[PDB]
Amino acid sequence: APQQINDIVHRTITPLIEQQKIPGMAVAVIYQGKPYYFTWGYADIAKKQPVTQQTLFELGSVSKTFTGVLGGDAIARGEIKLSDPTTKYWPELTAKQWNGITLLHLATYTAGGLPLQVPDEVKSSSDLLRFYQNWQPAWAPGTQRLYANSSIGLFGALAVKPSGLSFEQAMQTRVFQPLKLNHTWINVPPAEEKNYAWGYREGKAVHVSPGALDAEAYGVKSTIEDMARWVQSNLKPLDINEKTLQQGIQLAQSRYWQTGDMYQGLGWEMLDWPVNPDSIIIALAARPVKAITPPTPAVRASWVHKTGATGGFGSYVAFIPEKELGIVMLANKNYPNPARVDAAWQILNALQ
Ligand SMILES: Nc1ccc(C(=O)O)cc1O
Ligand SMILES: Nc1ccc(C(=O)O)cc1O
Ligand SMILES: Nc1ccc(C(=O)O)cc1O
Ligand SMILES: Nc1ccc(C(=O)O)cc1O
Ligand SMILES: Nc1ccc(C(=O)O)cc1O
Ligand SMILES: Nc1ccc(C(=O)O)cc1O
Ligand SMILES: Nc1ccc(C(=O)O)cc1O
Ligand SMILES: Nc1ccc(C(=O)O)cc1O
């Protein structure tokens, strides 16, 4: 822990925690291929349990980065293609609006206005089919981006079908295990209960509610160590020994669509480095997309990032491959996104 990293981190995070009243927080800075860990406050306020390097936080939508890489791994395996129609992997999807909707569209929120959430009442596999069959698109496929758990969530479920594995089995065996993420869970086991932090929404202790496609969209829990390892894996994919995982990370960081200065990958979102901080610092934001023809392979000169939130948690991951530099910020309160990106910006810009 060099003093350069120590001082900038404590100078940035301490005021953030006070200003946002965050009960507990874990931060990892990846600098020249080594992680540096920082922890504040409480994982459990009532039981006085401190945040540590073993504390599990809910990642929220940062889960979509694991989903995107797993999908990319399936592509590398020759099991799926992003150009394949959705109907190829779900033939019961016989409704005529699904003509021309591909796995890429699901992965990148460009199917034509799939809703932010799968409705809470949708539970069975029959419910899900009925839900997607009855969905009426607002736009043609590949024309507008509308962020949606029902879009990326379905991509994840369909992407693992040719493997013959469940999503959870696929993620564990193809992403978690090979990358040594031994404390990253879709479902937290009883042995890990003590490490599992409580989230805090308006003073109330809360964990993420179960739902359809939760594992695929927002259900991963992890520690600051594993997330630091996840960042390193994404910083330097070609150092990973697994052939298809290496390629799947690169596919997930490819630029498929452009909306202004933002580029949409699989899970990951990117901007050209150097980034105007104002470009990175609303319930529904429909944005027209420019197709990148063909998609640009993972650009090392990039700000790659993803925000995530659940009711009780707020997370943020950001990295710059070119600089071998990254940050993970995990907190057990859902606080404003600009505050996360600002703090991350302050730290990484000081270190680059
Ligand atoms: N809202 C729309 C939905 C689908 C199509 C299409 O061409 O498939 C076009 C639209 O304007
Ligand atoms: N291991 C655990 C799994 C689920 C929950 C929950 O609150 O849903 C809590 C746990 O400690
Ligand atoms: N005992 C507690 C005190 C304060 C808070 C809070 O969220 O500020 C939560 C608690 O469970
Ligand atoms: N309460 C729940 C609602 C939906 C689902 C699901 O798998 O869709 C699971 C649940 O435990
Ligand atoms: N062009 C490059 C691609 C990947 C890596 C790596 O470390 O994975 C490094 C590079 O210079
Ligand atoms: N590293 C950077 C510093 C300052 C600015 C700016 O727009 O002021 C942008 C950057 O990418
Ligand atoms: N200060 C900056 C202004 C514009 C851009 C850009 O990529 O358009 C980047 C910057 O660092
Ligand atoms: N997208 C979601 C975010 C938060 C929660 C929660 O239960 O806190 C559930 C979701 O389906």
UniProtKB/Swiss-Prot annotation:
This is Beta-lactamase. It comes from the Bacteria. Changing residue 216 to K: Increases activity about 150-fold with respect to cefotaxime. Reduces activity about 5-fold with respect to cephalothin. Reduces thermodynamic stability. It comes from Escherichia coli (strain K12). The lineage of its organism: Bacteria, Pseudomonadati, Pseudomonadota, Gammaproteobacteria, Enterobacterales. Its main location: periplasm. Keywords: Antibiotic resistance, Hydrolase, Periplasm, Signal. The active site is at residue 61. One of its GO terms (biological process) is antibiotic catabolic process. Induction: Can be induced by beta-lactams. Expression is not up-regulated by the non-beta-lactam inhibitor, benzo(b)thiophene-2-boronic acid (BZBTH2B). It is found in: Periplasm. The class C beta-lactamase family has a specific amino-acid numbering system known as SANC, for structural alignment-based numbering of class C beta-lactamases, or else the simpler name structural position. A multiple sequence alignment was used to derive a consensus sequence and then the consensus was numbered taking into account insertions and deletions. This allows use of identical numbers, e.g. for active site residues, despite differences in protein length. It is an enzyme of class 3 (hydrolase). GO terms for molecular function: beta-lactamase activity. Changing residue 289 to E: Increases activity about 100-fold with respect to cefotaxime. Reduces activity about 5-fold with respect to cephalothin. Reduces thermodynamic stability. Belongs to the class-C beta-lactamase family. One of its GO terms (cellular component) is outer membrane-bounded periplasmic space.
